[PDB]
Design a protein around this nucleic acid. Structure first.
Length: 90
DNA sequence: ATAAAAGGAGAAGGG
DNA sequence: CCCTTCTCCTTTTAT
């Protein structure tokens, strides 16, 4: 199965949900969610995983915070903003 | 200042 | 094992 950090990174490279998520500094690998349209992207995440309950941003954010220990994705000091690691980017 | 929202995390449960 | 789900508390942001 696909991993969350790859689901997001795939969307940014595809632009398939430009209204829900966009780059902030492509070079630094920072990105940000749309306050109004993030739930739609969260919805698409739970479905792709076939989860029991419909996915919400809070549950997805909880999952993202776990990447803080392994380093794939760290939270940035800007609203709804995260950052990929150089390894994840290449 | 205050509601609302974003952020946080321990625990237990599910593919 | 990679999240998922629930629950409760805190900080930040929007009103």
């Amino acid at each position: 199965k696909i991993r969350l950090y790859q689901f997001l990174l795939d969307l940014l490279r595809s632009g398939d949900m430009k209204d829900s998520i966009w780059w902030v500094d492509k070079d630094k690998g920072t990105f940000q969610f749309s306050s109004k349209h993030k739930e739609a992207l969260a919805h698409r995440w739970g479905i792709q995983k076939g989860n029991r309950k419909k996915m919400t941003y809070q549950k997805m954010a909880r999952a993202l915070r776990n990447y803080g220990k392994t380093g794939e994705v760290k939270k940035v000091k800007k609203k709804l903003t995260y950052q990929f690691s150089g390894e994840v980017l290449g």
